[PDB]
Short mmCIF file of C-alpha atoms and ligand atoms in Angstrom, two decimals:
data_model
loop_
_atom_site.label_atom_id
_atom_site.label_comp_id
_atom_site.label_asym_id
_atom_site.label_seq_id
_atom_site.Cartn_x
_atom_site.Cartn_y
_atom_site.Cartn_z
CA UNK A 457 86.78 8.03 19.74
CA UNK A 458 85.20 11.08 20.77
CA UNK A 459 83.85 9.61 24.15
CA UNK A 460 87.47 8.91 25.28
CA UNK A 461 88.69 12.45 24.39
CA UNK A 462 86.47 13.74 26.16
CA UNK A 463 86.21 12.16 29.39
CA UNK A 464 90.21 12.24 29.64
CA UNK A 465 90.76 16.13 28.81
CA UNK A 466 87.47 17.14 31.35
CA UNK A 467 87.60 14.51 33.64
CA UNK A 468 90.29 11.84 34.05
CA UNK A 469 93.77 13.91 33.38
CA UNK A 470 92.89 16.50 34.86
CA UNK A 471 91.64 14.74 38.22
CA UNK A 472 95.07 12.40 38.00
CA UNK A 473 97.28 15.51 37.48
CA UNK A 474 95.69 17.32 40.11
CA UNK A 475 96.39 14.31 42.81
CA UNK A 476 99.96 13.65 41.58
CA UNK A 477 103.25 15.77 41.38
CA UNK A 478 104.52 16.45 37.88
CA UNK A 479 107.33 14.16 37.61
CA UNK A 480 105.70 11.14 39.85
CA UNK A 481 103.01 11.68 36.65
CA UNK A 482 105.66 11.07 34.67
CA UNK A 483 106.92 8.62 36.11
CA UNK A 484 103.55 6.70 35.88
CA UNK A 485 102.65 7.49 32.62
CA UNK A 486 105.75 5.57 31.33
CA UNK A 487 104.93 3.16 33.83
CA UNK A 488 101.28 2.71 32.25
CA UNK A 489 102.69 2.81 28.97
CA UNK A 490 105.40 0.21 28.90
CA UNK A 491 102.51 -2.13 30.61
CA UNK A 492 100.37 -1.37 27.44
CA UNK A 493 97.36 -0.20 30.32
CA UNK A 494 95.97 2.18 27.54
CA UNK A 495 92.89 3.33 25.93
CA UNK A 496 91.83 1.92 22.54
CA UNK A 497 93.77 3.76 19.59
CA UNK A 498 90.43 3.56 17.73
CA UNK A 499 91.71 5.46 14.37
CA UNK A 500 92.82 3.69 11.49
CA UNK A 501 95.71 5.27 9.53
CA UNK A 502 94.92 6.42 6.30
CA UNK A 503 97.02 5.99 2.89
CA UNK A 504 96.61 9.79 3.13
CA UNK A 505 98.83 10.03 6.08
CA UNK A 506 101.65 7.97 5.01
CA UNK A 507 104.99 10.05 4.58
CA UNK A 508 108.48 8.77 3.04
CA UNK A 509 111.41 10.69 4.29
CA UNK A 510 114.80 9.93 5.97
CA UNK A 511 115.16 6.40 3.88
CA UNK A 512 111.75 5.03 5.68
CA UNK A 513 107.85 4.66 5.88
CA UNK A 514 105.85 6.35 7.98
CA UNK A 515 102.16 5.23 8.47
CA UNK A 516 101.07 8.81 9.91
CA UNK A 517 102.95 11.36 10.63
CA UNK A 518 102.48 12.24 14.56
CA UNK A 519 105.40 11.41 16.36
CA UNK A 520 106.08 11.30 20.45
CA UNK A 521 109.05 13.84 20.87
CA UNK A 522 111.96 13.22 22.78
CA UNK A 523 111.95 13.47 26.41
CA UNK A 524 108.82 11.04 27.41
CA UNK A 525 110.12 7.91 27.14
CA UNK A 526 114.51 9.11 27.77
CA UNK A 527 115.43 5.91 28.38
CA UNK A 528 113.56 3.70 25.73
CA UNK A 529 111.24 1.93 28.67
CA UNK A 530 108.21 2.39 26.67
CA UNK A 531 108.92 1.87 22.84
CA UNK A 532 106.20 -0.55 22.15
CA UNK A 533 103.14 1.27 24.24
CA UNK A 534 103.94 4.24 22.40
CA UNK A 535 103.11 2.63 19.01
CA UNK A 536 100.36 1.26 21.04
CA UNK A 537 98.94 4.88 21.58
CA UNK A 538 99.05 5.55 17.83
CA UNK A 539 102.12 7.54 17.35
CA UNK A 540 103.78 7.08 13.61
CA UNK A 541 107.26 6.99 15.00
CA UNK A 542 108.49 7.04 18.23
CA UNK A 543 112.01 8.99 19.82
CA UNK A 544 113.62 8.37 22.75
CA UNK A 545 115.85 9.95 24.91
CA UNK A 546 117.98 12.34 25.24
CA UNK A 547 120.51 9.78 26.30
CA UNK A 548 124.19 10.50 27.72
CA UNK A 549 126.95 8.56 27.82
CA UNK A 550 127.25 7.87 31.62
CA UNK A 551 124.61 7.75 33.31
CA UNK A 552 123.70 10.55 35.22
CA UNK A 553 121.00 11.77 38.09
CA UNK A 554 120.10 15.12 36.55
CA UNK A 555 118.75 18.15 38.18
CA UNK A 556 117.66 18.24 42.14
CA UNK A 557 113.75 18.34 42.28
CA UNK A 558 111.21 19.68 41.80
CA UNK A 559 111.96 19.65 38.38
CA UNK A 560 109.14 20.02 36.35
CA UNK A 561 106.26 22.45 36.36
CA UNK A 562 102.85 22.80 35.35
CA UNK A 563 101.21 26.12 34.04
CA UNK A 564 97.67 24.45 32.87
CA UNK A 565 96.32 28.15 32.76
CA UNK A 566 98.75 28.50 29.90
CA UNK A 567 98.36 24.81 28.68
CA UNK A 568 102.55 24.71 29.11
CA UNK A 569 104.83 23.14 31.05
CA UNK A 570 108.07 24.12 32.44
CA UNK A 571 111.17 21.58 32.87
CA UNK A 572 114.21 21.74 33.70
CA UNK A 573 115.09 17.74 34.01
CA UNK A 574 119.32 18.17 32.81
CA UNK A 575 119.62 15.18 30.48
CA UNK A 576 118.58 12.79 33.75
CA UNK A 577 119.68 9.70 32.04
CA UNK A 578 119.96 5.49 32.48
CA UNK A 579 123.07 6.19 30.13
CA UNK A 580 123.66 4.26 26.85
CA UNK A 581 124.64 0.90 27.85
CA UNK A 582 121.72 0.68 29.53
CA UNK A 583 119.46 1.99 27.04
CA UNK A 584 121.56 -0.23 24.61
CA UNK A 585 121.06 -3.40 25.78
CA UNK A 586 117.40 -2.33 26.80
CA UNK A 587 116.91 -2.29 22.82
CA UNK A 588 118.79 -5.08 22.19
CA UNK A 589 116.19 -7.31 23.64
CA UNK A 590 113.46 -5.72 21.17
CA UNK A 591 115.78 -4.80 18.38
CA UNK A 592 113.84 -7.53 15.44
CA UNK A 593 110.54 -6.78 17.07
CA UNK A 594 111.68 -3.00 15.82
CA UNK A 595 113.23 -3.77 12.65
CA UNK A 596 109.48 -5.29 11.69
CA UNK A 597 108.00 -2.25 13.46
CA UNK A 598 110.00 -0.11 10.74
CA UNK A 599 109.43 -2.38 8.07
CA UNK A 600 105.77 -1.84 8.68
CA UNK A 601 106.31 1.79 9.05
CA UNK A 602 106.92 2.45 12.80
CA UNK A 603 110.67 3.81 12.56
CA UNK A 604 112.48 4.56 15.99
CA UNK A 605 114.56 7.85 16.70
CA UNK A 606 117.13 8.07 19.25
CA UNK A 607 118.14 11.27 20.84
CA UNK A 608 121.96 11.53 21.86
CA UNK A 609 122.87 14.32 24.83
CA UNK A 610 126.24 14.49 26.34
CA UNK A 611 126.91 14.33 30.40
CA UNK A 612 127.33 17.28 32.34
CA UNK A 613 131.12 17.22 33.29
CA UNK A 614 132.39 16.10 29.43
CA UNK A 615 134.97 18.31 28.38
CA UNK A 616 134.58 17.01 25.15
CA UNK A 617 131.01 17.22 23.78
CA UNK A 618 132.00 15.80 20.35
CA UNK A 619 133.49 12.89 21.80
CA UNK A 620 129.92 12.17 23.75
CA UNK A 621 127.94 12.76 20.64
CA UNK A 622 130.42 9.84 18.62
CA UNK A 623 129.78 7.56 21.83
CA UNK A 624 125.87 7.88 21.15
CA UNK A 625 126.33 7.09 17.90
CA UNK A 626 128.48 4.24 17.91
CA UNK A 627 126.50 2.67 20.62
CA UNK A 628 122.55 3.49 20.24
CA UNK A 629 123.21 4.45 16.12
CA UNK A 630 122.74 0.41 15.24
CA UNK A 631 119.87 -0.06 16.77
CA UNK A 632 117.98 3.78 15.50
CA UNK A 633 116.63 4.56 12.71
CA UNK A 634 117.44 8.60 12.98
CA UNK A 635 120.12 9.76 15.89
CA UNK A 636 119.43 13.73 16.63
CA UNK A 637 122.40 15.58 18.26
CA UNK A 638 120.46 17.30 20.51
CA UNK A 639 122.01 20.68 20.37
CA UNK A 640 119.18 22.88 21.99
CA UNK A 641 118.32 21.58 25.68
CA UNK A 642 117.77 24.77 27.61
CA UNK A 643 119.07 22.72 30.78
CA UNK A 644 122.69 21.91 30.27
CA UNK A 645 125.60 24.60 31.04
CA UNK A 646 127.04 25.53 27.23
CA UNK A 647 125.23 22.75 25.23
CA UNK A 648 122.95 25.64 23.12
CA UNK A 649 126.93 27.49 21.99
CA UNK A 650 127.14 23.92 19.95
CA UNK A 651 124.75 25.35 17.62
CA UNK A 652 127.33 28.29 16.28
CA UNK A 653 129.28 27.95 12.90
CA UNK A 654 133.27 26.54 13.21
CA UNK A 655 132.48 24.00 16.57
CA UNK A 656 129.31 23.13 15.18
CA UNK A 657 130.64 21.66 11.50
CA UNK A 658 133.31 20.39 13.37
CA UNK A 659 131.14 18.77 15.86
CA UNK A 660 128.70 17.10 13.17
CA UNK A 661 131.77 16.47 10.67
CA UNK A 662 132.65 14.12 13.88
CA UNK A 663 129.26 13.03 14.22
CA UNK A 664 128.97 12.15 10.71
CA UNK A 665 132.24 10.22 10.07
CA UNK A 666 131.11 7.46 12.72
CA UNK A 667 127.75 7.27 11.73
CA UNK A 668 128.81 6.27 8.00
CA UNK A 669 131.39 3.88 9.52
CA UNK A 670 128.23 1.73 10.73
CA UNK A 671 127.63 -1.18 8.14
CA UNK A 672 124.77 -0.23 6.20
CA UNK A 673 121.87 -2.08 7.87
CA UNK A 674 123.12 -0.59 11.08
CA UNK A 675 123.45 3.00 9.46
CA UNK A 676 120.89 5.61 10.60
CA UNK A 677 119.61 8.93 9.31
CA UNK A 678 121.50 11.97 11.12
CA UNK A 679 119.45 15.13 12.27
CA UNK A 680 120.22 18.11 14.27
CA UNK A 681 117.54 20.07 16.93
CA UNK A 682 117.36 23.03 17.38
CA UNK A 683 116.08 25.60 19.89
CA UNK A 684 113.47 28.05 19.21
CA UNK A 685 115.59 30.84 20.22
CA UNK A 686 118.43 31.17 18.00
CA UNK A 687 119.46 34.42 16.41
CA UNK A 688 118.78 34.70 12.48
CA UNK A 689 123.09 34.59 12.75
CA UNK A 690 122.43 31.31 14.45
CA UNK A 691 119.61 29.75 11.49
CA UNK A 692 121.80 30.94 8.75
CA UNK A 693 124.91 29.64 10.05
CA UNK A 694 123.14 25.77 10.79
CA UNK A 695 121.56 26.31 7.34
CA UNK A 696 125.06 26.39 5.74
CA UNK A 697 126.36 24.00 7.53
CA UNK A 698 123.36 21.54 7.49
CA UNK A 699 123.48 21.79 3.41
CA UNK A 700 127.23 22.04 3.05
CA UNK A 701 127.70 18.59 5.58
CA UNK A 702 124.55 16.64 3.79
CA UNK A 703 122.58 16.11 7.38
CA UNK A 704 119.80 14.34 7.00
CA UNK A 705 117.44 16.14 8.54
CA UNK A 706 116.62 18.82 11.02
CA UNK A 707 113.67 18.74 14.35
CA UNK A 708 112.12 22.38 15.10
CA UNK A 709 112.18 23.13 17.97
CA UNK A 710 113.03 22.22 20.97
CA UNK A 711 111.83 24.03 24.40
CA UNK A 712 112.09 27.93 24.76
CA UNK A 713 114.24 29.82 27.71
CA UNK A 714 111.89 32.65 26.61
CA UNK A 715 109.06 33.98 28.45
CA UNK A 716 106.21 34.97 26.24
CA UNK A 717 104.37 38.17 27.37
CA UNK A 718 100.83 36.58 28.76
CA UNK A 719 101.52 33.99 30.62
CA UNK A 720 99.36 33.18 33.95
CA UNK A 721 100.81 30.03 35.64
CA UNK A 722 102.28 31.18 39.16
CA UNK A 723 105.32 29.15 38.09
CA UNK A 724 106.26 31.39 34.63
CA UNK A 725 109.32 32.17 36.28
CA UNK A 726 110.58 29.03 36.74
CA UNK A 727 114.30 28.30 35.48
CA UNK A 728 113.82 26.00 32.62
CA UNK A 729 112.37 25.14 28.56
CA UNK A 730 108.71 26.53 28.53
CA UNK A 731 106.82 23.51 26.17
CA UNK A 732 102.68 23.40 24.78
CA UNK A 733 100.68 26.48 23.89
CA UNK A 734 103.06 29.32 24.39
CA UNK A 735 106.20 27.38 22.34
CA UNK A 736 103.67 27.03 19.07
CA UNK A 737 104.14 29.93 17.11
CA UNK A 738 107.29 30.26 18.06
CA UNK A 739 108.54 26.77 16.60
CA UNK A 740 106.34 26.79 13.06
CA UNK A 741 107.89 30.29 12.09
CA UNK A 742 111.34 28.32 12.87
CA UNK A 743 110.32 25.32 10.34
CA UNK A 744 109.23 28.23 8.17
CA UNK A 745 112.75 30.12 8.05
CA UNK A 746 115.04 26.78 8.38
CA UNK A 747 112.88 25.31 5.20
CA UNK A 748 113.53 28.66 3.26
CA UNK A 749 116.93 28.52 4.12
CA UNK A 750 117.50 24.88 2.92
CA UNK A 751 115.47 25.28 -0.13
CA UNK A 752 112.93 22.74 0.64
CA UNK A 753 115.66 20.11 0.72
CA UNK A 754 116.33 19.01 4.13
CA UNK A 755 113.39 17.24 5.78
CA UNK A 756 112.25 18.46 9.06
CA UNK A 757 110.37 17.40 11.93
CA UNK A 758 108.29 20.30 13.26
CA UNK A 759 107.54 20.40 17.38
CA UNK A 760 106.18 22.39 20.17
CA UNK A 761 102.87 23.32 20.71
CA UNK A 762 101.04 20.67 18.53
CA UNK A 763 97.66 19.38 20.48
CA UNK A 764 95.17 19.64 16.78
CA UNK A 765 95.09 18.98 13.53
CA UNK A 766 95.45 22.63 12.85
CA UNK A 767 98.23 22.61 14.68
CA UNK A 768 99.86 19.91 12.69
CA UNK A 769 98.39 20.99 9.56
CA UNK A 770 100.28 24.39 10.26
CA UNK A 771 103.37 23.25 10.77
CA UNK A 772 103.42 20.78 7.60
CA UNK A 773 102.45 23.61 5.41
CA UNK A 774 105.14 25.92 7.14
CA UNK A 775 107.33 22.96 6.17
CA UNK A 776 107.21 19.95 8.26
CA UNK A 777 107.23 16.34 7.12
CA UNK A 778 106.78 15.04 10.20
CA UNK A 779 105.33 16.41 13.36
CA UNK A 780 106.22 15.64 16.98
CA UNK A 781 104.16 16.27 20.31
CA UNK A 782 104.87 15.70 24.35
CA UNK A 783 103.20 18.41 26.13
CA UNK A 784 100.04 18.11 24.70
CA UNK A 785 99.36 14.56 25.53
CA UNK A 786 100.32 15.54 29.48
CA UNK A 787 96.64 17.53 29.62
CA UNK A 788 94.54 15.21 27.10
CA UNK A 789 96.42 11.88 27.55
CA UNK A 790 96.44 9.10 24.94
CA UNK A 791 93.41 9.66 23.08
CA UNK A 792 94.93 13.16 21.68
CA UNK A 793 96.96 10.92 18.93
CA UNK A 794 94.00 9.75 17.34
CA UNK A 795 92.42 13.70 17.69
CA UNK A 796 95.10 14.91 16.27
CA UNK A 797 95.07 12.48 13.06
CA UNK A 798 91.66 12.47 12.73
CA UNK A 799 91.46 16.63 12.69
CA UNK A 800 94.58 16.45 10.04
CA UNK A 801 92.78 13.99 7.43
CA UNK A 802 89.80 15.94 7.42
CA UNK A 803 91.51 18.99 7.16
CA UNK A 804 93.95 17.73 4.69
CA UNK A 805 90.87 16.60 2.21
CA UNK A 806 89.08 20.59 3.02
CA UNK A 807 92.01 22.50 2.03
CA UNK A 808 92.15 19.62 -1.17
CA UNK A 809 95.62 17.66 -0.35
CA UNK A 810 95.89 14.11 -1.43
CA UNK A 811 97.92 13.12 1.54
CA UNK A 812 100.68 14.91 3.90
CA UNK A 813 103.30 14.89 1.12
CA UNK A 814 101.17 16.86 -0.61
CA UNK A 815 101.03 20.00 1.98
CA UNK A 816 104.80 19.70 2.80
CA UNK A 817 105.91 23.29 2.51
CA UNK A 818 102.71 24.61 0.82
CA UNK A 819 102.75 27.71 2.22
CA UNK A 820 105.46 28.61 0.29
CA UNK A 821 104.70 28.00 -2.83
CA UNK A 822 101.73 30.99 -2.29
C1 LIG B 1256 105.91 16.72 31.54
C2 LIG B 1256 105.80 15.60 32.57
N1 LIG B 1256 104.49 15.00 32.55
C3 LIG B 1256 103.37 15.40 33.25
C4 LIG B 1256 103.28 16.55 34.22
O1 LIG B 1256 103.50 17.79 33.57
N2 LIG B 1256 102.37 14.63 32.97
N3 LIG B 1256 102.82 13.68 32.07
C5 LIG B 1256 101.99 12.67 31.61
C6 LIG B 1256 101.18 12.04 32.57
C7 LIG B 1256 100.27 11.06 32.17
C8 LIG B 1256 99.46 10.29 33.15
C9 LIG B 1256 99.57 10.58 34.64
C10 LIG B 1256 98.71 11.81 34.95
C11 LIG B 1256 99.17 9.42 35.56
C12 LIG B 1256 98.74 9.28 32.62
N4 LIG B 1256 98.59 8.99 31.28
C13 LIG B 1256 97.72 7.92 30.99
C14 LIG B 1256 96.38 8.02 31.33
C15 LIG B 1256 95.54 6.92 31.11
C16 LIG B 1256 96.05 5.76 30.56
C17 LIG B 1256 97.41 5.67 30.24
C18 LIG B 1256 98.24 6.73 30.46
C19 LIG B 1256 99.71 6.60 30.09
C20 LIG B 1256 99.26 9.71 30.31
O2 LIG B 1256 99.12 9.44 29.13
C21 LIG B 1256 100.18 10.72 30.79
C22 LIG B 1256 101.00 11.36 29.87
C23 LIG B 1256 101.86 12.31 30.28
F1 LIG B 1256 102.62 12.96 29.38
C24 LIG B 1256 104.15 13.90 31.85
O3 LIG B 1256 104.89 13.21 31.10
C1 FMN B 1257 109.53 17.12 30.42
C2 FMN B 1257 110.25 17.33 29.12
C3 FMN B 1257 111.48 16.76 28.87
C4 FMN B 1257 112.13 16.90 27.67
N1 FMN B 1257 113.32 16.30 27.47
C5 FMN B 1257 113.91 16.37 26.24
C6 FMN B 1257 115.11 15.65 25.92
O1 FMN B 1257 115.64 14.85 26.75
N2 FMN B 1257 115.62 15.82 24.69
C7 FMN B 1257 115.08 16.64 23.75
O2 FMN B 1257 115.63 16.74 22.63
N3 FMN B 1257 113.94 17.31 23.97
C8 FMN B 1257 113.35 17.17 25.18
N4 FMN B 1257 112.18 17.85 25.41
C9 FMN B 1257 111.61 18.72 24.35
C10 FMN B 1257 110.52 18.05 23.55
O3 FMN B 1257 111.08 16.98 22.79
C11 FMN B 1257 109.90 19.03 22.58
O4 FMN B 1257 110.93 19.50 21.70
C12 FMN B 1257 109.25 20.24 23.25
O5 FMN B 1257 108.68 19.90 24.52
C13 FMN B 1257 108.16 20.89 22.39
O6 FMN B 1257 107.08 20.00 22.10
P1 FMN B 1257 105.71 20.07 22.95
O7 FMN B 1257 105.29 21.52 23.05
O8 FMN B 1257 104.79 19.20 22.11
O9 FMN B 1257 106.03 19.44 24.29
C14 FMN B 1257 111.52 17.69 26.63
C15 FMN B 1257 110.29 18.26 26.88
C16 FMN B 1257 109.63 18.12 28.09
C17 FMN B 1257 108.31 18.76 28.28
O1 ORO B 1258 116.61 17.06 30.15
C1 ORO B 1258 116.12 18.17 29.99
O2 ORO B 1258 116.12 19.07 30.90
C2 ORO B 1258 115.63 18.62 28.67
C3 ORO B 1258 116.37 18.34 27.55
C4 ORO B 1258 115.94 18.94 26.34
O3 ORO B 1258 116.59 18.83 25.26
N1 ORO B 1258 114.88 19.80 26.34
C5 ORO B 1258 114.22 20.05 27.48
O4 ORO B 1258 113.22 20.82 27.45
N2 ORO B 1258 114.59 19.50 28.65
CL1 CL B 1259 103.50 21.92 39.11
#
C-alpha cells in the first residue's frame, strides 16, 4: 500500500500533472476511471469504519465529492478506487457548456486548486438514462453498502431556480440514494442568495414535496450544501429551516470565494472556489457550528481539505458522519483512499473509538 502512495504523490502525479493542462487531467482521470485502469485498492474495510446514516450502509466513510465524476461517467471505478459512497454531479436540467477556458487552476505550492467550471453539464436526461443502464448493478452496490449521491444544480438562464431543483429531483431522485440542492457553487450568478431564510424554505418546501411524491423504493434522502462563507445570519437561518423542514441531511462545505492570507500559487487571484489545503479549517469549524446549531440531529457530510486521516478524523469529531474529498486525490491520485482509511482506523483505535459512530461529534461532548 505504501509503495503505491508513494511513487504516485513523488513521482507519477506529479510528472502527469506537470505534462497535462488541468482540465485535459480531468478529463483523463475520468477517462481512466470509468475504464477501471487503476491501482490496486489494497485496504480492506474494517467493521470499524462502517457508518449508518441517511436510511443506508456505509462500508467506510470516505466519499468522492461532487464535481469529479458531474455527469455519472465513472460510478463504478470510483467504488473501484475505494471510496464508501460515491456523488455525482452537479447536474442541470439542460444541458449546458459552462464557463470559457481555462477553467481550472492549480496552486500545488498551496496544495489547492482553483475552479471556476459553471455547472458544465451533460444535463439530466443524459445523466438519467446513463444510470438507467447500471441502475440494479447500484441498487446491489447500496445493498452492500456503496450508496450513490446525486448533486442537482440549475442552468444558468432559469428564471426559476426552484423549478430546476424539482426537475432534478423528479428525474435523477429514482435512481439516488441522497439528492443535494447544491446551494453554494461559487460559479453561478445568484445561486449562493438561495441559501437566505423566506426563498430558501420555500425553495426546499418545493424540493421536498416532489421528493416524497417518489414511491418509496424510488424515494431518496434530501440534503442541502453549503458554502464555507456564509454569515453566522446565514448558518442560523439554514439551521432553522433545515430542523423546522426535516432535511435529511446537510454537506460542509463546498469551495471558498475567499482568499486566505498565505497563499503562494501565481494563480491566487483567479476568479473562482479555492478547494484542498487552504479550504480545511475553514469547512470543519462550519460542521462544528451547523452540528451545534442542529443539536447533533441532522447528519452531515464534512468536505474540503481532507487528504489524512487526521484530516478526516477532525472533521468526524467536529461532527461529520461522513467525509468527502476531490482535491486531494488530484496531487496523490488513487492510492490516497486507502491512506486516508488506513490513517483513520489507526487513529480511531489511539484516541480509543470503537468505530466512526463512535467519534461523531466528540468534540463536543468535551
Ligand atoms: C481539479 C481537476 N483535476 C486535476 C487538475 O487540477 N487533476 N485531476 C485529477 C487528475 C488525475 C490524473 C491525471 C493527472 C492524468 C490521473 N489519475 C490517475 C492516475 C493513475 C491511475 C488512474 C488515475 C485515474 C487520477 O486519479 C487523477 C485524479 C484527479 F482528480 C482533476 O480532477
Ligand atoms: C474542479 C471542481 C469542481 C467542482 N464541482 C462541483 C459541483 O459540480 N458541485 C458541487 O456541489 N461541488 C463541486 N465542487 C466542490 C467539491 O465537491 C468540494 O465541496 C470542494 O472541492 C472541497 O473538497 P476538496 O477540498 O476535497 O476538493 C467542485 C470542486 C472542484 C475542485
Ligand atoms: O461547476 C462549478 O464551477 C462548481 C460547482 C460547485 O458547486 N462548486 C465548485 O467549486 N465549482
Ligand atoms: Cl494551472
Amino acid at each position: 500500500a505504501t509503495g503505491d502512495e508513494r511513487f504516485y504523490a513523488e513521482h507519477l502525479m506529479p510528472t502527469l500533472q506537470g505534462l497535462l493542462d488541468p482540465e485535459s487531467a480531468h478529463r483523463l482521470a475520468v477517462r481512466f476511471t470509468s475504464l477501471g485502469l487503476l491501482p490496486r485498492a489494497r485496504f480492506q474495510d474494517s467493521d470499524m469504519l462502517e457508518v449508518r446514516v441517511l436510511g443506508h450502509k456505509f462500508r467506510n466513510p470516505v466519499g468522492i465529492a461532487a464535481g469529479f465524476d458531474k455527469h455519472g461517467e465513472a460510478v463504478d471505478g470510483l467504488y473501484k478506487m475505494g471510496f464508501g459512497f460515491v456523488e455525482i454531479g452537479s447536474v442541470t436540467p439542460k444541458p449546458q457548456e459552462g464557463n470559457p477556458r481555462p477553467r481550472v487552476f492549480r496552486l500545488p505550492e498551496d496544495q489547492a486548486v482553483i475552479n471556476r467550471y459553471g455547472f458544465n453539464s451533460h444535463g439530466l436526461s443524459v445523466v438519467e438514462h446513463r444510470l438507467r443502464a447500471r441502475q440494479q448493478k447500484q441498487a446491489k452496490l447500496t445493498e452492500d453498502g456503496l450508496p450513490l449521491g446525486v448533486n442537482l444544480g440549475k442552468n444558468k438562464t432559469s428564471v426559476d431556480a426552484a423549478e430546476d431543483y424539482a426537475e432534478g429531483v423528479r428525474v435523477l431522485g429514482p435512481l439516488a440514494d441522497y439528492l443535494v440542492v447544491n446551494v453554494s457553487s461559487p460559479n453561478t450568478a445568484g445561486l449562493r442568495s438561495l441559501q437566505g431564510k423566506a426563498e430558501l424554505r420555500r425553495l426546499l418546501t418545493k424540493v421536498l414535496q416532489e421528493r416524497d411524491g417518489l414511491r418509496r423504493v424510488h424515494r431518496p434522502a434530501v440534503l442541502v450544501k453549503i458554502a464555507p462563507d456564509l454569515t453566522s445570519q446565514d448558518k442560523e437561518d439554514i439551521a432553522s429551516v433545515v430542523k423546522e423542514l426535516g432535511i435529511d441531511g446537510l454537506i460542509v462545505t463546498n469551495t471558498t470565494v475567499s482568499r486566505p492570507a498565505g497563499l503562494q500559487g501565481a494563480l491566487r487571484s483567479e476568479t473562482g472556489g479555492l478547494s484542498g489545503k487552504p479550504l480545511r479549517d475553514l469547512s470543519t469549524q462550519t460542521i462544528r457550528e451547523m452540528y451545534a446549531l442542529t443539536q447533533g440531529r441532522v447528519p452531515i457530510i464534512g468536505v474540503g481539505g481532507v487528504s489524512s486521516g487526521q484530516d478526516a478524523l477532525e472533521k468526524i469529531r467536529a461532527g461529520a458522519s461522513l467525509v468527502q474529498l476531490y482535491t486531494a486525490l488530484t496531487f496523490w491520485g488513487p492510492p490516497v483512499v486507502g491512506k486516508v482509511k488506513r490513517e483513520l482506523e489507526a487513529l480511531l483505535k489511539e484516541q480509543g473509538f470503537g468505530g466512526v459512530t463512535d467519534a461523531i461529534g466528540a468534540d463536543h461532548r468535551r
